[PDB]
Amino acid sequence: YLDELRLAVAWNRVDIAQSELFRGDIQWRSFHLEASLMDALLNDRP
């Protein structure tokens, strides 16, 4: 299932994650972060 954070990590843009995380319009869940960290570790995005 396509979401926003995994598409941001597939790109290299940080500001999209900045705005999506710091923006208070939608409260963030846990499954999105727990899945996307796995894709962050593999492609060497420190």
């Binding site: 208070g24 319009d25 939608i26 409260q27």
Partner: protein
């Protein structure tokens, strides 16, 4: 509460305070509108 104040000041490493504010309210748990987030994000943390 004199005992618990002496506990917090003496044993644990906390310094004695200068100002005690107390947030005391209930919104019920929806997401708040944006200028309340600006208020608690600018006024009660920078001053604190």
């Amino acid at each position: 509460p004199a005992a618990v104040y002496s506990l917090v000041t003496r044993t644990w490493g906390f310094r004695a305070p200068n100002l005690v504010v107390s947030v005391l309210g209930g919104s019920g748990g929806p997401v708040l509108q944006t200028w309340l987030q600006d208020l608690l994000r600018r006024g009660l943390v920078r001053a604190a």
